[PDB]
Amino acid sequence: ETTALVCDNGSGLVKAGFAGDDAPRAVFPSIVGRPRSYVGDEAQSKRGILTLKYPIEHGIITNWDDMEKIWHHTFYNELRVAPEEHPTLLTEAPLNPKANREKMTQIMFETFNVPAMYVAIQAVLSLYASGRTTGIVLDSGDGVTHNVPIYEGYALPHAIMRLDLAGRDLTDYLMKILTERGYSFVTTAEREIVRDIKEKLCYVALDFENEMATAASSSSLEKSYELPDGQVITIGNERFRCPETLFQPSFIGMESAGIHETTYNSIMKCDIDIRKDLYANNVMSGGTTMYPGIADRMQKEITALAPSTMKIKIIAPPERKYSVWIGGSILASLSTFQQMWITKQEYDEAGPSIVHR
Amino acid sequence: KYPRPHKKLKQLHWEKLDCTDNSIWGTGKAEKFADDLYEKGVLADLEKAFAAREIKSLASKRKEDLQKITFLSRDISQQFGINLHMYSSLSVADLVKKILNCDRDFLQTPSVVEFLSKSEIIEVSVNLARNYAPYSTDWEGVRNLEDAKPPEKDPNDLQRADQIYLQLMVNLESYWGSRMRALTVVTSYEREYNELLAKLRKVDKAVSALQESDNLRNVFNVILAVGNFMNDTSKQAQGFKLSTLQRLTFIKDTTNSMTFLNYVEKIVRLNYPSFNDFLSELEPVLDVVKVSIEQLVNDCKDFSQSIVNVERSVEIGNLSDSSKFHPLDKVLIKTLPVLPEARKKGDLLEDEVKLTIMEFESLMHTYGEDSGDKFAKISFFKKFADFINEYKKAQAQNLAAEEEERLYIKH
Ligand SMILES: Nc1ncnc2c1ncn2[C@@H]1O[C@H](COP(=O)(O)OP(=O)(O)OP(=O)(O)O)[C@@H](O)[C@H]1O
Numbered sequence: 200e201t202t203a204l205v206c207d208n209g210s211g212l213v214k215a216g217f218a219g220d221d222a223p224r225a226v227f228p229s230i231v232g233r234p235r236s237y238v239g240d241e242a243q244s245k246r247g248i249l250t251l252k253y254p255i256e257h258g259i260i261t262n263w264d265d266m267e268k269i270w271h272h273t274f275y276n277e278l279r280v281a282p283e284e285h286p287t288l289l290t291e292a293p294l295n296p297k298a299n300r301e302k303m304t305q306i307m308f309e310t311f312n313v314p315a316m317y318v319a320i321q322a323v324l325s326l327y328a329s330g331r332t333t334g335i336v337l338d339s340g341d342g343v344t345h346n347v348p349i350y351e352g353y354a355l356p357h358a359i360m361r362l363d364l365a366g367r368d369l370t371d372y373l374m375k376i377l378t379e380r381g382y383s384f385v386t387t388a389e390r391e392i393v394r395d396i397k398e399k400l401c402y403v404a405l406d407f408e409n410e411m412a413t414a415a416s417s418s419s420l421e422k423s424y425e426l427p428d429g430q431v432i433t434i435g436n437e438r439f440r441c442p443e444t445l446f447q448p449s450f451i452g453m454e455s456a457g458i459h460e461t462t463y464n465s466i467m468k469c470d471i472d473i474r475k476d477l478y479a480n481n482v483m484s485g486g487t488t489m490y491p492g493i494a495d496r497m498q499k500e501i502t503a504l505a506p507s508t509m510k511i512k513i514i515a516p517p518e519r520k521y522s523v524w525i526g527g528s529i530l531a532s533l534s535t536f537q538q539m540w541i542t543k544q545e546y547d548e549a550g551p552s553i554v555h556r
Numbered sequence: 557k558y559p560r561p562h563k564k565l566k567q568l569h570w571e572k573l574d575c576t577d578n579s580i581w582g583t584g585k586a587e588k589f590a591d592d593l594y595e596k597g598v599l600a601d602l603e604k605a606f607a608a609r610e611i612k613s614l615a616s617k618r619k620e621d622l623q624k625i626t627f628l629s630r631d632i633s634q635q636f637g638i639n640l641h642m643y644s645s646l647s648v649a650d651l652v653k654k655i656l657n658c659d660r661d662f663l664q665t666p667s668v669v670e671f672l673s674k675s676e677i678i679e680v681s682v683n684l685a686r687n688y689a690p691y692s693t694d695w696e697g698v699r700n701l702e703d704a705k706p707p708e709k710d711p712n713d714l715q716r717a718d719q720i721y722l723q724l725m726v727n728l729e730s731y732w733g734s735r736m737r738a739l740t741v742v743t744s745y746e747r748e749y750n751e752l753l754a755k756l757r758k759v760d761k762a763v764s765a766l767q768e769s770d771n772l773r774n775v776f777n778v779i780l781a782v783g784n785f786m787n788d789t790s791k792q793a794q795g796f797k798l799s800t801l802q803r804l805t806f807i808k809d810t811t812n813s814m815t816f817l818n819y820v821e822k823i824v825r826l827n828y829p830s831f832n833d834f835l836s837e838l839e840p841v842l843d844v845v846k847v848s849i850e851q852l853v854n855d856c857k858d859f860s861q862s863i864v865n866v867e868r869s870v871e872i873g874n875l876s877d878s879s880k881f882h883p884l885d886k887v888l889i890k891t892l893p894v895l896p897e898a899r900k901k902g903d904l905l906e907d908e909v910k911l912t913i914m915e916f917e918s919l920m921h922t923y924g925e926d927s928g929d930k931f932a933k934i935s936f937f938k939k940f941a942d943f944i945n946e947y948k949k950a951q952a953q954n955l956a957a958e959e960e961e962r963l964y965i966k967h
């Protein structure tokens with residue numbers, strides 16, 4: 200009998216379950232509670248006393264005391280499995296500094312008698328469940344948004360774009376404007392359940408020089424939400440206002456070159472000979488990429504900057520907001536590849552520096 | 557000389573220092589604590605506490621697919637298990653049924669449709685086929701599972717990923733290509749139609765805006781005018797080409813405060829501001845600046861002629877002799893149901909594209925673009941676009957510059 204878990208660690212939301220699955224049989228936010236340890240979800244309803252941590256900043260782990268906490272929680276709690284009897288797939292950001300791939304793995308083998316484990320790049324795994332095994336990805340969940348050129352599971356180190364705008368980055372510019380329309384959103388809970396506007400609503404037009412004129416020349420784009428307090432909130436030209444930021448870095452000062460713009464320059468960084476298919480294969484990954492209406496909103500802008508004789512298929516899976524995790528259950532349910540594992544054995548003999556080779 | 561534990565202990569992967577030279581190690585202190593802490597009790601537990609517990613090992617069932625034969629490049633064997641990743645749990649055979657037996661879960665996900673009709677996956681080489689012959693099949697006649705059955709050299713020795721390649725790209729070789737070009741049309745022809753026809757309207761209803769916009773025409777006329785008034789005898793002319801447009805901006809005024817295109821704009825709005833409608837009417841043209849019009853067509857000639865070919869195959873070859881159709885290949889039970897209406901819209905688009913191209917080439921012939929010159933054929937719109945914006949820009953500059961020429965006028 201046999202089994203294998205897959206854990207995609209992220210800035211904002213941990214996301215993990217088992218092998219050959221449809222998605223994670225568990226998910227929560229990367230958050231840890233310690234007094235002036237209670238991790239995960241029962242960590243909001245425990246604010247004030249325990250100050251709150253985010254073991255991961257922009258994709259990269261920054262607090263290992265806590266990070267360890269999560270991986271612990273993850274298993275024994277939202278999985279009920281207890282290591283040892285399980286090979287584990289962990290994930291890591293493009294360009295995760297060797298240092299941590301070691302500190303990462305160590306934690307496992309040492310702290311949970313994990314028999315085997317491999318550490319996969321976040322883009323890449325994404326593009327695996329899109330069928331392809333080549334061409335530029337746009338992972339872009341909460342903390343960070345990377346632009347990763349790929350090619351037969353092989354990312355191009357010198358042509359990866361890392362941009363520091365994304366999830367909570369946006370969940371933020373919203374709260375900005377909602378009160379600029381006089382609202383109760385400043386406090387905390389009156390924020391958690393407000394990124395939420397963004398998730399359950401919040402689309403993106405195709406152009407503002409043509410849709411900001413549908414409430415500033417109209418009154419049909421509103422909508423409302425039922426706040427835990429009852430008092431309903433009516434949202435206006437909001438759903439699509441913030442996400443504009445990706446394309447529109449500026450919105451929060453962000454002097455940044457934009458998401459679609461980057462997929463562009465990025466590619467122009469790696470060789471020409473692959474570009475056709477790069478363009479022909481824009482897979483996209485979780486969070487900030489799955490707002491309704493960004494799929495083809497991208498497509499537009501990109502096909503725009505891009506040449507007029509270029510194939511430009513711009514993918515966007517069932518729920519890429521699990522793209523990377525999904526691909527995760529694939530390259531492992533996919534058995535055969537099993538010769539990419541690192542047995543506690545191999546580890547015990549060489550140690551950290553082995554997670555690498 | 558060092559003391560040692562009875563059971564394996566949790567290793568301390570450290571990075572040793574080699575030369576002891578003038579360190580702190582070398583004075584043997586290390587050796588005192590050595591035995592000391594051993595007799596003094598200590599190590600005894602340090603032993604018990606960091607006892608490295610055993611390590612389980614399993615999987616196997618999918619491991620061993622390793623040991624079995626494989627004539628398929630890691631890449632491929634891999635990019636099967638990639639898209640056939642939903643059929644993971646199904647055995648090497650369960651799955652093939654579900655595929656020949658064109659389920660509604662397989663045909664629905666193009667990822668798999670597309671894959672399976674990938675030239676790189678279809679095309680088998682002699683050098684390749686050979687390797688698979690001792691395990692192939694013929695299905696000539698065969699109308700039941702158990703019939704055929706001449707395994708001869710057994711197929712089980714191959715890696716899972718290898719087997720599929722066999723029972724499908726090999727054993728149904730003869731027709732797999734067309735079988736797939738068909739199932740595809742089946743599954744695609746729908747949207748893959750609306751998609752074009754619309755792509756075609758964004759042309760037709762911009763090429764339209766140009767047809768009639770007495771406005772636009774007039775503006776040029778106003779330029780031809782000022783042109784001739786400026787140009788000299790040898791340079792007078794009853795009409796010019798679009799290639800003129802882009803060099804309006806260079807002609808500066810005296811005090812380089814004006815771009816000729818400014819006056820031209822100013823002039824309209826203040827003598828005929830009954831024409832600045834072209835900058836409204838003609839936007840639909842901008843909505844297609846980069847459209848490869850010479851390949852929009854061809855994509856349509858591709859649509860129809862593709863169907864007009866799953867047709868040819870149902871009758872005169874490939875997709876006729878239900879005999880080779882591995883008993884289960886429920887393609888026909890699935891093709892024909894739609895082959896009819898499909899082809900209808902196949903002849904539809906044709907008509908439409910006839911109706912359109914000819915029209916288009918006409919508007920072009922007008923301004924002087926030869927419907928037969930790759931370049932203008934497409935670089936056409938862009939000059940109208942370019943002009944417009946160069947203009948929508950001169951307009952601004954002028955409408956704003958005319959503001960500043962009010963305050964430094966009042967204050
Ligand atoms: N359903 C949704 N629709 C639109 N946006 C969402 C949705 N869910 C989350 N988001 C936004 O994207 C973020 C989550 O994305 P994801 O889970 O991929 O982040 P992540 O794991 O932190 O990835 P990374 O660490 O690279 O930032 C949320 O914090 C929010 O900003």
Ligand SMILES: [Ca+2]
Nearest residue numbers: 208209321340
């Ligand atoms: Ca992520």
